[PDB]
Each structure stands twice: as structure tokens, then as C-alpha cells.
Design goal:
Blueprint lengths: L2 E3 L5 H15 L6 H6 L2 H13 L6 E6 L5 E9 L10 E8 L8 H15 L4 E7 L3 H10 L2 E10 L2 E11 L6
Parallel strand pairs: 4-5
Antiparallel strand pairs: 1-2, 2-3, 3-4, 5-7, 6-7
Helix pairs in contact: 1-3
This protein binds acetyl coenzyme *A.
């Protein structure tokens, strides 16, 4: 239903959306061991430390169900040294619980963050997504993202490919 900035009380819910969607989306792509390892508590604490840090440049958003549960979230911030001059912002994470997907929540989250990054003066934003994640890829391609590059990372013990999509913030109306 609605999108808003996250508060500290929203984090336990943010952590569940994160872990549950990671588990549902990366089955057979990211090692089972690693996926089983994710922690609701660990995740909630990590975001909590960030939210509590006054100088943290990250921006957090959550998507609410009709009754108010946190069923989606998105984090935006400065790029994390991706090596693409001209791309100063990055979509750190965006996840919507499987059953709440394809109802416009991801788009709404995306637009809210891009709007804020635009107001903060970032010219362009990129996003990294697993080469083997059709869901996220299809979503970004549909939204206009242009393929920028790729890199191999290692999650769990697995070496995996990741691709980047670029989006224009300046000038565009989000
Ligand atoms: C940010 C990094 O972590 S990359 C990882 C991204 N997260 C994941 O892959 C986790 C699994 N997936 C999800 O959480 C969600 O599906 C997301 C975040 C990828 C997308 O959010 P959703 O709410 O499902 O998409 P939403 O309903 O807002 O779709 C918006 C538009 O994109 C289109 N779209 C969304 N996904 C796809 C897709 N996979 N293929 C083609 N089109 C798509 C929708 O049809 C819609 O089109 P429309 O505006 O013309 O009607």
C-alpha cells in the first residue's frame, strides 16, 4: 500500500523481509549453507547501528501492507566504489516478500529513493544484481536500467557473477 522512511521499530520486520526474500530468491544460486546462515537478529542489528549513526549517508524505506506490516524495503546511498565514473549513487538493496511482489511495491520503493537521491544531488544511480537473478534483472530492465558492467563476487564459498544497471537521476522525473 504505502511507502515511507524506516524507523528503528521497523527493523525487525525489515530483517525478516530481507532474509526471507533472499532465501526465496537465491535458492540454488547462492549456497544453501549461506542462506540458512542469514540471521533475523544479526540483520536487524546491522541496520540499527547504521540508522543510529548521524553521519551515515544511507536512506531507508519500507513498504507497508494494507494492515501496516512491513512487506518490502529499500536502501539507497552513495555508490560503494563500483568503478563507473558518473555513477555516484547506488541502490544498496531492494526486496519485497514473494507474495507481495508484482503489485507495484518495488516500483514505488524505487521511485521514492531515486527522488530523494535526486534531491540530494546525485546525478546517476547504479545497482548490482546477480547475473542469475531474472526477477531483479527483469525489474531493472523494465524500469529503464542500462547494463553497465559485470564482476565476479564470492558469497558463501561460491564464486558468482554480478551485473550492474545504470539509471539517470538528474533531469528525469521520478
Ligand atoms: C537491490 C539489489 O538487492 S538487486 C535484488 C533485487 N531483489 C530481488 O531480486 C528479490 C526478489 N524480487 C523482489 O523483491 C521484487 O520482485 C523486486 C524488488 C525485484 C521488484 O519489485 P516488485 O514489487 O515485484 O515489482 P513491481 O510490481 O513494482 O513492478 C514494477 C514494473 O516492473 C515490471 N517488472 C517487475 N519485475 C519484472 C520482471 N522480473 N520482469 C519483467 N518485468 C518486471 C512490472 O511488470 C511492472 O511493470 P509496469 O510498471 O509496466 O506495470
Amino acid at each position: 500500500v504505502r511507502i515511507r522512511r524506516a524507523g528503528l521499530e521497523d527493523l525487525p520486520g525489515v530483517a525478516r523481509v530481507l532474509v526471507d526474500t533472499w532465501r526465496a530468491t537465491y535458492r540454488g544460486v547462492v549456497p544453501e549453507a549461506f542462506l540458512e546462515g542469514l540471521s533475523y537478529e544479526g540483520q536487524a542489528e546491522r541496520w540499527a547501528q547504521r540508522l543510529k549513526t548521524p553521519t551515515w549517508p544511507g536512506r531507508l524505506f519500507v513498504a507497508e501492507s494494507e494492515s501496516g506490516e512491513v512487506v518490502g524495503f529499500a536502501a539507497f546511498g552513495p555508490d560503494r566504489a563500483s568503478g563507473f565514473p558518473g555513477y555516484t549513487a547506488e541502490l544498496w538493496a531492494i526486496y519485497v516478500l514473494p507474495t507481495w511482489q508484482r503489485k507495484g511495491l518495488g516500483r514505488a520503493l524505487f521511485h521514492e529513493g531515486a527522488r530523494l537521491l535526486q534531491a540530494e544531488g546525485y546525478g546517476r544511480m547504479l545497482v548490482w544484481v546477480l547475473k542469475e537473478n531474472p526477477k531483479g534483472r527483469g525489474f531493472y530492465e523494465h524500469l529503464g536500467g542500462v547494463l553497465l558492467g559485470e564482476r565476479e563476487i564470492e558469497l558463501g564459498g561460491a564464486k558468482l557473477w554480478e551485473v550492474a544497471y545504470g539509471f539517470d537521476l538528474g533531469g528525469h522525473k521520478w
